[PDB]
DNA sequence: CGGCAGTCGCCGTCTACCTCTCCAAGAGCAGCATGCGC
DNA sequence: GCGCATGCTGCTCTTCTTTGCCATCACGGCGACTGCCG
RNA sequence: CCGAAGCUUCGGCUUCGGCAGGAGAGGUA
């Protein structure tokens, strides 16, 4: 939910996402970039970090 | 905090229960801040009870002012004497009739 | 559509004030429809990605 | 000539009573003349009118 | 020369200075090409003052 | 149409009821500041008095309530009400925007998430960082391709 | 010394694609204006106007 | 010419005139004229047509009037406005930051039926903003300018589309007026009319019909040739007249009980009432004239008949069968046809007059509401006029118009050009037009109707393409608001010298011919066939024996800015656009110089903006100084003119005026006495003349460079002044009052030598970054102390000490000497704003020189930045060892479509040195066609090409082997316009010749020194702590989205988690990392945004319960304080 | 009941930078302070 | 000499929505819905 | 966090003083 809220249509997913409980992984670049981590591409994957 | 160890963020639906629970007091005048002094009001919008002091270390009256004091809550006004950074991060509810 | 009528003389004779005015109509639509993709393919582009 | 100074004026974006021309304009005029010095050290001239 | 960077009164004013002294310059060459490879240049100058 | 919500609300370990309020949170001051307006005075914050009228309704409610008054005027206490909370949780959605000086809309609390010029597309998708700098650029033909 | 080696990045909207980023390795010169290679103008897609 | 004294600009126009062009700023002036009532605009309206000399206040103050109450027993009534004096004058109103305005009167009378009394007085309406003589508004001491707009007219309007499944033409009708509600009749996928009524539902027109009081019979006795209205008469199932009303009332009020007597006073209350709908004046004179009803009588009332809905019917029926001529009982024949919304003869424009009269009305219906709804809760014997008025909402609708509105816009004085043309633009958008949005690509193409009215090059280049234009030169606009423009008429194939102006409405029905037509000494076309324009802007070649009108000038169809670019027809559309939109750019040098070639517009262009000084009679000049003129009239009275001496303008540039007479002149009337800004003896001059060499160089002028000489920094030849203000004022406060003063307890005494007795600077002082400018200090609150320190500090010393400092300083990178100083008090009597005590400005000036990244142009669509700049010893120079000015590419010419400048560098070379051609064995053939006074030219002669007709190709040719030698007997540039130039770095020549001139080149408002900016750290926001934004408050620079995806691509996943953490948002990082970098240890590792936490926060007063869990369950808390 | 087609509302419409102006006020309810009258 | 009356002035809100005011709003895609016809 | 002033054992300690939001218009690439 967090990836398609900050594309479009964020009350909709919201209210959607509030209802259905959902849990994000966060395990994606944008979500990642958001919460302020490493994204899981180039240096920042395993073998190389 | 470390980024390092989050694993989940989860939404869903509050209940009056958890608005009761994450709240730190209820605010009743709708006034909002003295003009003339410059202080804000008790019960209001800006209140120091419910949410912070507005400057460090301090309260409402003159009691406690030093860094020593901390962690003593005021007896006869009611702030509480710490930092002025909790003012960004502690919240209030409003009580529907 | 095409003007039946043509331009005669080239930009080294100069033209005349009514060849000068018709030939104003399609060099004002290209300027006014590249502003026009431009904001169209930037949608695309954040849509895509 | 490195610097001029005029009686009355302060800087160069004014005007001085009783002359057609503004010190900026009167600046730009002298920026014409030629001279010819000797010595090793700045000298000055003068320059009264009436 | 900013007045405020050697300590000078109000009332002066600094004024941009060229002390060239020179105002033309020109060269025109002719060249001897004749066979037998016996050659060489001729320069003229011409200098003008102020 | 109809199962894609009432099957929801039945997998989980939630219930329906959290769509009646009967408590509203208030969002920590620091987040809706009020300052001089250039040692004049206090000009608006936009979100400081949508809950001025939540307040007001309220206790107007309360009074009226504990007092005896008849059936239909605190109906009406109570529609104003619920009005006021609507208003303040989603300005313009129903009816006509509560404007203020100058016949300018109100800005709720959801129109701080939405649109291109909201939190998630202008404060967390970009910032404005330091050790930074701007100028006009020219052509330099001495310079190697480093 | 302090910039002997030390990289920057240059930058041009809009970035529509990678090379609308580039790093470089300054030099100080006179002036108020920045120096680009020529042959960069491609990627960035500069003129000089 | 025309000119009392003017420079001789000799000319290679080979066509005469007949006309002159009017006054250019008689588009803003004769508006105000109007509305305002006086007695110029007056005579102008008795001169033709004198049948109604009705103000704009005056119709306003009548239509209003009287005001009657519900009972009937009162009424009031107004007339009569009439002005005071102005209380200020400009300049006074522009120093003490005032408006420049004069009280209005009107007079009220109150009659009471009951008894038959009547009292009237006189009443106050507060004070009237009023225009300067240049055409603008002092407001609040800002110069403002207000700007027409293009709005579509009321009246009638078909239509015609395709159908999607029939394919077949679909016809509708649209009413619209001023103010009212809105009709719309059409035709239906079937043979079924319809009438959709205030814009809801959709009913067949025959309830209409009925409801109006029509029998079944009558309709056939009329419409009685179409079966769609045997169709529609045959299904209406509401036979009888009131069932019609019961179900009009039906579908246009809900939920009501149908009640006749309630539809009939619905009904009338939509459409035949004067109250509600106003067809107005344009709208019915444009409804009389489509559907040709009663045509002749004058126009009074304004409001909808049964015989114009009947008509509009009529129409519909006649245009959907196919008929072309249709005839109204009691009307003229009129065609039937479908109008288009963009022509310009549906357009009209509103002016300022009718943008002010609106705003006046709105006011004066609030003011009528409330004294109709206090005029009975007072009691009567003490009602009069003077207690029922409120002047509040007239104020209060004038001062937001004046204020925050769209249409009156800041006025640009960057030149006296951008002032001229800020004055003279249409604007299509605005309250009641459209939006920059919304607006697609029809509404912004040149119409075969703009020839003469708008001009089809000068506008925008950003998102406001084609919704901004200007006026033509000989454009006038009629009484209603349509553009006219004139043509001389032709009579048996002779010309005329008789001009009638036609509206875009009249000329589709004439041929038209055009401007360059060979017309003989009697007046007779040579070409047997000429190019012409017929009715629907159609291009033909038909023979000169049919047309009826002819063009006045071949510059009729361009505006003030392009009739002054040389060889315009020689260039391309989209480069002449820049070429005139960069004219307005220029800033003002310290010396000026007019063109080598000109146009010959540039004298009246500069006469009618206003910033020179004209004589307005005729006498002998008595004395002349740097400040004033004195001249001495005939009769015996004298005159004396003040001048602005380093005024600042709107955009920081200088208004210096200087005088250009002797001691002893003689002056006539209309003479300019002063010069200007950018000014060159009467004459517009924005740029410098240069010399120039079209070629390559070593790759400095690559991709539009520039590289100049040397000499023109050691010269003066392009420089400007700029002049800054700042303010700062001192108050009271709840502890005290601040006070302006020299003593400050904080600071030393090396940084207050520059301060006078008074806490101010001293004017000539020399003044940097961080430097002071004023002394003022803040009270913190005077009161009692602890008793123990009262005897302490009698033996030590106890001061007052609540004083603070703040001082204004000047802002980061600025500089510059002090030339003034204004202090205002409250004490002297003076305006002051209420809890204030003193005012003070400072103005501060610098001089600019070119320089790197500076913009220069040209009048052709050059355009680029300075690369670089060489010493004079560098540069490539002629055979007599004179250096060039200005080098240019020639890899930008060809593939531009601007060759105007190599002919314009061609004749600057030409008219820079001086020809004369010879005749001894009669005139060349090349020069038959040329002037006796331009066979022979004297060295730095002025000529003049007109727009579109100047100098031919055959005489630059021919006049490029004509020019006279140098000192030596040389001719440096032979007959192509090419010389041999040699190397100044290396010393051989050239090995091909080289093209070489004189070129106009102006410098623009776009400096270098204005964009460069560096940061390292500096101040951060409130909410969310990034860092602020913008160069004025030392702001970052933003790193979008667009920029995250290259970084993402790349694969830098340490780069950008460092730009997006430590240096944003990361409060506890922030110290952290500067720490580091000071002591040499290593970075340390980010922490958490802080834009996170005040996202969750704002999700959490949602009533959204969202939490951040860890591996385990077990949420994080999320808010550090441990 | 059962299709059915108009209709009405909600969603979206490129990035970065510069300069300027303007951002609810009158009405009302006490609370006295002093002047005037018997 | 005392009581009553009216104007400076603290002092804290208050600002709607009918039978009125108000005037409109592109352009395309999508989806419910809702009265309407059969 | 910065400045001023004291103690200062040279790590630092103490007193006082101090903030940054919207709407509209025009423009450059
Ligand atoms: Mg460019
Ligand atoms: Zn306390």
Redesign the pocket.
Known sequence: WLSAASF?????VLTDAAINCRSDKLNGLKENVIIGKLIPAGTGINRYR | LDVNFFDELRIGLATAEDIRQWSYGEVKK??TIN??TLKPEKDGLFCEKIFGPTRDWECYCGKY???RFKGIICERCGVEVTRAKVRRERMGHIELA | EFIPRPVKSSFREGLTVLEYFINTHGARKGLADT?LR??????LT?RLV | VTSIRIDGVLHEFTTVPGVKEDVTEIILNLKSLVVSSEEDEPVTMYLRKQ | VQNRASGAEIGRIPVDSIYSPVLKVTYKVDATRVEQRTDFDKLILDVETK | ?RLKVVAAFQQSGNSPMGMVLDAVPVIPPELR?M????GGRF??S?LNDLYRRVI?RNNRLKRLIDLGAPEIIVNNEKR?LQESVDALFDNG?RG?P???????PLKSLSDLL????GRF?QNLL?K?VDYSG?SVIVVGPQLKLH | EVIAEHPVLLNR??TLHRLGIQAFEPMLVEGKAIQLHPLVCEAFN??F? | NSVPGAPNRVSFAKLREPLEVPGLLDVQTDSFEWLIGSPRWRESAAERGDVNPVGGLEEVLYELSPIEDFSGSMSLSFSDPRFDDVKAPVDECKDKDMTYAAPLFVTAEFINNNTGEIKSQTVFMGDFPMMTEKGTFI??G?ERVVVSQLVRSPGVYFDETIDKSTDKTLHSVKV??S????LEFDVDKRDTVGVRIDR???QPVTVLLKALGWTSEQIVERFGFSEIMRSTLEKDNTVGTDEALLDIYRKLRPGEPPTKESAQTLLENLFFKEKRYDLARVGRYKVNKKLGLHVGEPITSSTLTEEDVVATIEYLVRLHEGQTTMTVPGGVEVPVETDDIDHFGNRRLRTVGELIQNQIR?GM??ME?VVRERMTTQDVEAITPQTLI?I?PVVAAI?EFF????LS??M?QNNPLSGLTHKRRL?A?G??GL????A?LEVRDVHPSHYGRMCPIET?????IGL?GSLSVYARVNPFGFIETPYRKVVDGVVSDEIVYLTADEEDRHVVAQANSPIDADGRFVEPRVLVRRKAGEVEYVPSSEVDYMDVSPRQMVSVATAMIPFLEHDDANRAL?GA??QR?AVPLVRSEAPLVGTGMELRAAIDAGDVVVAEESGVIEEVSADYITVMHDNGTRRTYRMRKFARS?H?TCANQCPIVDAGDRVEAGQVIADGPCTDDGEMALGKNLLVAIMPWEGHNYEDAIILSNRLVEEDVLTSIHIEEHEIDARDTKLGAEEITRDIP?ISDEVLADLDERGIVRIGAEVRDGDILVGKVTP?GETELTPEERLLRAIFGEKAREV?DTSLKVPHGESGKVIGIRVFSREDEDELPAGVNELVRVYVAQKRKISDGDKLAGRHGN?GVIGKILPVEDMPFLADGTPVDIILNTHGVPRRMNIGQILETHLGWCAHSGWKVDAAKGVPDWAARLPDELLEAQPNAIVSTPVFDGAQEAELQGLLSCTLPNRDGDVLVDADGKAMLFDGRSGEPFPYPVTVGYMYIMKLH?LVD??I?ARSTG?????TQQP??????F????F????CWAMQAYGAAYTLQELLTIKSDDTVGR?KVYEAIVKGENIPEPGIPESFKVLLKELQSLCLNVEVLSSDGAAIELREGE
């Open positions: 479009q249509e964020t009350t909709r | 709708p006034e003009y003339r002012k030093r860094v | 502003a431009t904001a169209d393919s930037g949608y954040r | 149409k500041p300052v001089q307006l250039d000009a608006t936009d007001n104003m959605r006509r509560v404007t203020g000086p100058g016949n300018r939405k649109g291109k010029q597309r970009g404005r701007r | 909207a809009p500069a003129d106007d | 407001i609040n800002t619209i007026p103010r009212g509600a809105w809801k539902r959709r709105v219906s609030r509401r409120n509040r001062k204020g925050t509105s769209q816009q800041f640009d604007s958008l309250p009641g939006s920059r949005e919304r697609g925008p280049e950003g998102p406001n901004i820049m939109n960069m750019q709107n920081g904080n913190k603070r355009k776009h204005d964009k900016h101040p951060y926001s409130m909410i602020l934004g913008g160069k004025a408050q702001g970052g620079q933003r979008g989205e667009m920029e110290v």
